[PDB]
Swiss-Prot record, chain B:
This is Major capsid protein. Belongs to the herpesviridae major capsid protein family. Homomultimer. Makes the hexons and eleven out of twelve pentons. Interacts with triplex proteins 1/TRX1 and 2/TRX2; adjacent capsomers are linked together in groups of three by triplexes, heterotrimeric complexes composed of one molecule of TRX1 and two molecules of TRX2. Interacts with scaffold protein; this interaction allows efficient MCP transport to the host nucleus. Interacts with capsid vertex component 2/CVC2. Interacts with the small capsomere-interacting protein/SCP. Self-assembles to form an icosahedral capsid with a T=16 symmetry, about 200 nm in diameter, and consisting of 150 hexons and 12 pentons (total of 162 capsomers). Hexons form the edges and faces of the capsid and are each composed of six MCP molecules. In contrast, one penton is found at each of the 12 vertices. Eleven of the pentons are MCP pentamers, while the last vertex is occupied by the portal complex. It comes from Varicella-zoster virus (strain Dumas) (HHV-3). The chain holds residues 1347 to 1394 of 1396 of the full protein. It is found in: Virion; Host nucleus.
From Swiss-Prot, chain H:
Belongs to the herpesviridae major capsid protein family. Homomultimer. Makes the hexons and eleven out of twelve pentons. Interacts with triplex proteins 1/TRX1 and 2/TRX2; adjacent capsomers are linked together in groups of three by triplexes, heterotrimeric complexes composed of one molecule of TRX1 and two molecules of TRX2. Interacts with scaffold protein; this interaction allows efficient MCP transport to the host nucleus. Interacts with capsid vertex component 2/CVC2. Interacts with the small capsomere-interacting protein/SCP. Self-assembles to form an icosahedral capsid with a T=16 symmetry, about 200 nm in diameter, and consisting of 150 hexons and 12 pentons (total of 162 capsomers). Hexons form the edges and faces of the capsid and are each composed of six MCP molecules. In contrast, one penton is found at each of the 12 vertices. Eleven of the pentons are MCP pentamers, while the last vertex is occupied by the portal complex. It comes from Varicella-zoster virus (strain Dumas) (HHV-3). It is found in: Virion; Host nucleus. It comes from the Viruses. The chain holds residues 1102 to 1199 of 1396 of the full protein. The lineage of its organism: Viruses, Duplodnaviria, Heunggongvirae, Peploviricota, Herviviricetes. This is Major capsid protein.
From Swiss-Prot, chain I:
This is Major capsid protein. It is found in: Virion; Host nucleus. It comes from Varicella-zoster virus (strain Dumas) (HHV-3). Coiled coil: none annotated. Homomultimer. Makes the hexons and eleven out of twelve pentons. Interacts with triplex proteins 1/TRX1 and 2/TRX2; adjacent capsomers are linked together in groups of three by triplexes, heterotrimeric complexes composed of one molecule of TRX1 and two molecules of TRX2. Interacts with scaffold protein; this interaction allows efficient MCP transport to the host nucleus. Interacts with capsid vertex component 2/CVC2. Interacts with the small capsomere-interacting protein/SCP. Transmembrane segments: none annotated. It comes from the Viruses. The gene is MCP. Self-assembles to form an icosahedral capsid with a T=16 symmetry, about 200 nm in diameter, and consisting of 150 hexons and 12 pentons (total of 162 capsomers). Hexons form the edges and faces of the capsid and are each composed of six MCP molecules. In contrast, one penton is found at each of the 12 vertices. Eleven of the pentons are MCP pentamers, while the last vertex is occupied by the portal complex. Belongs to the herpesviridae major capsid protein family.
């Protein structure tokens, strides 16, 4: 980028980091907006290599796409009313491959 | 151990009573007197 | 000496101060990662049998390796919840008598009386014997506090300073600086942060907010800048050491990538085993995400020049009147808006 | 990191405005909102105002570091300096005359001692003009006590 | 990485254009298209001039553009291909095959660029053609006919 | 294996638990999405046996 | 429990000569009991008065 | 085309388009607002970049006038005043916010 | 393109009205607002004055 | 005075000038220079085909530019001899204050 675009991006970034800081305790009262930026977080990382034979899938057969690690309190807040359950069981590979 | 509870006051309560019973006196103070207030448990029960 | 007399008596000498104070907060994070985020290799276990008090100790060990097999970024962490604040937002006068090395005053009696009057009015004081060949640790604390004592450093600045500067995310140096401003050459990190023939970058109509803490060898720089190492012997952390110290540079990577590299959890620079927010103890490894450290900014909290306007007339929101006559109320702009109730 | 100004005094007279007749007044004869502030009051870790005042800065300002100008002089001496008149920075000695001949001689010399305008007379500058980079005296204002 | 080839027809934007081949396009001077449109008429009485049905004849002309893409070959690739300095040993056959793999992998993307860029040109021309909505809507509404 | 930051503030963080929320029922006759924030987080919580 | 309690208290730090909405405890004339100390101790016992 | 040490092939293809619509066949309308690229700043336009008008009779007056205009401004002609030049403003350090 | 009048002084006397008596008072014996204005204040890209 | 031909009616010309006219400034420079030769950037241009400008939120005194309510800005029109021009540009609800 040229200078001007970088400066504008920088100011926007500073504003964003000042705002989006404690998002789980500030906007605790809006379940819909919570799901609105979780989807932003998921769709902001690039994928990785697609080499595999057997992968982590649900009972239907759909392949999973990632893991989202939390603290127990956070997991419960997300499960209560924000995110919607897809399945309660999973298919997990049972061998390393040496 | 060590520390403390409270309710809401006014001493010249010639900062106390005009017509409400709810949320009324909160800016700390009116002329030269002492207008204590409010931070132990129960907010808004039992109207006056 | 006359400053001692006036500042005690209640007089207001023709200067003004800006305070800076560093705080910690415990936060619960939120991590996401894609499928093939790490290519992970496992070795084969091997055992060392090591003699013990009466018997033997078997130490099973196993080597392993990890690789990033992702072209882009495969993991994003975001600080999520505000748990407990860790340290105290107290009113803390930093004591500058912990430092030895400056040119001493001629009359040792005057220096002794100054140290007595400076350790006066304050908490953290060189212990009374004044040990030679020592770290000059403060009189060791008894039971501990409510939060780690967060030292507040003062910087001189002219009285008639534009108050509007502090109502937003400002910079204590008075002239915004940092690496984030580049584009044409490599030796501009010095021109931005010290050259005063060029306008300030942020407030692009003036050289610097205060000329007493922005030039190459002014008072503020001569006292806090880390390259001169004036407070080397003082174990007290200086919360404004990160604003006055020129950061090391490698221009090989472009600005955005370098920003991301600095954005991760940098190592701690304060104390979690010593109680006055001392300098970072050797061997201490705590990983702390550090905003307002990579942007060189400080957030102004809810403060008012007066106990007056701080609080208003509805039993709820606090006072909101900005300036009345010569007092002022700096409305909160820190990320702690909907937290830390009143 | 939080930042707060303490002794800042709003110099401009239009900025010392009150939002109604007395939107901060008294019963005393002198409304002392006109006196410059001397303290700053901030909510603690705890919902607690506490007090930071000028006097707390004495741990930082009353140290001997306020008179450590030697390094500053050494650094300043290593830049490009132009020959400037020495009217306001030179002190002579008497020549045991009648104090009238001395004044006449000084006037004659002073007819052309200064080829320009001294920098220390331009005190009419307002703060905005003083701060601006074009001010040549700006780089010579480093310590508050020098 | 295996780039995915995009065919212009599969894109939903293809519905906005009527594509057609024309090998002898470089010899066209002024391609011309014609219109002939008639309008209806109603009859009235009173102090109104009696009107006559009208015809319109509109003629438009073609606008010509182009597309270009590049394709590079390093000197060593040419040296290996021309067989000018070949030694007839298995060591250089691998080098030649590497060069040819580079050439083919390159040419595939170069050809794909035209498919990928026809959509770009269509977007460009449609943007240059469209008047803003905020003007077009009231204009097409608050005047019944014109004049 | 903590130091003098957690319980020297056992009276400065906990005594939070000395200043907000409280003994259920009946003045504010008017609120269902936090009354079960110490009701819907004190009944079922942690480690097994 | 215990608490503590009061008679009129005073502040010290000379920082409070402010105002918000007003014509005050003041008449046609000047200074009988109003620039002066508060009153004291009273209360408000069982059920509203 | 010959370059570097080898060759470059430039593949070209001519193509043409016609708008076969009697009325208007395309409508665009701005939808969302992104970050403003420019600065709502205060940079006073400097008229000393222009040459051609009748100069003042005394050259020292013009020089002093230019010099006093320079103070209190950002963009000014460079001090050497390059004869046969663009009279471009002196470049600066990094850009802040656009 | 934005346009702002800068040194305009409302000449006619009727227009120099105040919506309330005590609107912006000061300590000076002369109100420093009758004087003709000399500057214009607006907001920057980031909200900076 | 822009060069104009008057053969066609006003409305068609209004639509023709309504397209995204080519830019007449610079983007990569730090000072908004004149349009650099050879730069073809296509930008829609309102208030250029109507020969008008929109006044932004401005005032002659920073005191009335903001009200003491922890929220919206002031809106009084004229106090004594100052003024406060309310924003009328299309950016009413954007550009955070």
């Amino acid at each position: 980028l040229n200078r001007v675009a970088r400066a504008a991006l920088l100011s926007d970034l500073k504003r964003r980091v000042c705002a989006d800081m404690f998002f789980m305790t500030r906007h605790a009262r809006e379940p819909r907006l919570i799901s609105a930026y979780l989807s932003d977080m998921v769709s902001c990382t690039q994928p990785s290599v697609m080499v595999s034979r057997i992968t982590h899938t649900n009972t239907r057969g759909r392949q999973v796409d990632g893991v989202l690690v939390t603290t127990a309190t956070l997991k419960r807040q997300l499960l209560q009313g924000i995110l919607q359950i897809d399945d309660t069981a999973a298919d997990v590979p049972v061998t390393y491959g040496e | 151990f060590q520390e403390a509870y409270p309710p809401l006051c006014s001493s010249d309560a010639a900062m106390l009573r005009t017509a409400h019973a709810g949320e009324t006196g909160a800016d700390e103070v009116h002329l030269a007197q002492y207008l204590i207030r409010d931070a132990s448990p129960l907010r808004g029960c039992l109207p006056l | 000496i006359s400053l001692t007399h006036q500042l005690r008596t209640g007089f207001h000498p023709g200067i003004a101060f800006t305070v800076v104070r560093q705080d910690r907060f415990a936060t619960e994070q939120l991590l996401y990662a894609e499928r093939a985020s790490e290519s992970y290799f496992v070795g084969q276990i091997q055992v060392h049998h090591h003699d013990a008090i009466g018997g033997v100790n078997f130490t099973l060990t196993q080597p392993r390796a990890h690789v990033d097999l992702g072209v882009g970024y495969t993991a994003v962490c975001a600080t999520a919840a505000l748990r407990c604040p860790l340290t105290d937002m107290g009113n803390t006068a930093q004591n500058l008598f912990f430092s030895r090395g400056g040119v001493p005053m001629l009359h040792d009696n005057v220096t002794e009386s100054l140290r007595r009057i400076t350790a006066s009015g304050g908490r953290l004081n060189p212990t009374e014997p004044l040990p030679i060949f020592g770290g000059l640790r403060p009189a060791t604390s008894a039971g501990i506090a409510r939060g780690q004592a967060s030292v507040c450093e003062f910087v001189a600045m002219p009285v008639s300073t534009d108050l509007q500067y502090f109502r937003t995310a400002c910079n204590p140096r008075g002239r915004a600086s940092g690496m984030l401003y580049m584009g044409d050459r490599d030796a501009d990190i010095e021109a931005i942060m010290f050259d005063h023939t060029q306008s300030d970058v942020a407030y692009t109509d003036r050289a610097t907010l205060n000329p007493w803490a922005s030039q190459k060898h002014s008072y503020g720089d001569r006292l806090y800048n880390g390259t001169y190492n004036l407070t080397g012997a003082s174990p007290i952390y200086s919360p404004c050491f990160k604003f006055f110290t020129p950061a090391e540079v490698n221009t090989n990577c472009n600005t955005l990538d370098r920003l991301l590299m600095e954005a991760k959890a940098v190592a701690s620079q304060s104390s979690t085993d010593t109680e006055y927010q001392f300098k970072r103890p050797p061997g201490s490894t705590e990983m702390t995400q550090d905003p307002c450290g990579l942007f060189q900014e400080a957030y102004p909290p809810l403060c008012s020049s007066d106990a007056a306007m701080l609080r208003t007339a509805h039993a709820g929101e606090t006072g909101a009147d900005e300036v009345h006559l010569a007092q002022y109320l700096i409305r909160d702009a820190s990320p702690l808006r909907g937290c830390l109730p009143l | 990191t939080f930042i707060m100004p303490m002794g800042v005094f709003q110099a401009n007279s239009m900025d010392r405005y009150t939002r109604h007749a007395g939107d901060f007044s008294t019963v005393s004869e002198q409304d002392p909102r006109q006196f410059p502030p001397q303290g700053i009051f901030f909510y603690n870790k705890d919902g607690i105002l506490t007090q930071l005042t000028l006097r707390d800065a004495m741990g930082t300002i009353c140290h001997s570091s306020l008179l450590d100008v030697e390094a500053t002089l050494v650094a300043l001496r290593q830049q490009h300096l132009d020959r400037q008149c020495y009217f306001g920075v030179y002190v002579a000695e008497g020549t045991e005359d009648t104090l009238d001949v001395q004044m006449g001689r000084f006037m004659e010399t002073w007819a052309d001692m200064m080829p320009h305008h001294p920098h220390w007379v331009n005190e009419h500058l307002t703060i905005l003009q003083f701060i601006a980079p074009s001010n040549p005296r700006l780089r010579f204002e480093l310590n508050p006590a020098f | 990485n295996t780039l995915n080839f995009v065919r212009f027809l599969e894109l939903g934007l293809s519905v906005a254009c009527i594509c057609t081949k024309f090998p002898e396009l470089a010899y066209v001077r002024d391609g011309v298209i014609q219109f002939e449109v008639q309008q209806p008429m109603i009859a009235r009485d009173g102090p109104h001039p009696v009107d006559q049905p009208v015809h319109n004849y509109m003629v438009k002309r073609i606008h010509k553009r182009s597309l270009s893409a590049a394709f590079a070959i390093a000197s060593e690739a040419l040296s290996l291909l021309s067989n000018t300095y070949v030694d007839g040993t298995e060591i250089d056959s691998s080098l030649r095959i590497r060069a040819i793999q580079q050439m083919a992998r390159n040419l595939r993307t170069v050809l794909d660029s035209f498919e990928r860029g026809t959509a770009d040109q269509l977007l460009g021309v449609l943007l240059e053609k469209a008047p803003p909505l905020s003007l077009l809507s009231p204009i097409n509404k608050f005047q019944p006919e014109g004049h | 294996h903590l130091n003098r930051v957690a319980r020297a503030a056992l009276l400065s963080d906990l005594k939070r638990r000395v200043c907000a929320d409280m003994f259920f029922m009946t003045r504010h006759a008017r609120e269902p999405r936090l009354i079960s924030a110490y009701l819907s987080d004190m009944v079922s919580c942690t480690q097994p046996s | 429990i215990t608490f503590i309690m009061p008679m009129g208290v005073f502040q010290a730090n000379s920082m409070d000569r402010y105002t918000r909405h007003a014509g005050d405890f003041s008449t046609v004339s000047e200074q009988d009991p109003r620039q002066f100390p508060p009153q004291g101790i009273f209360f408000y016992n069982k059920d509203g008065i």
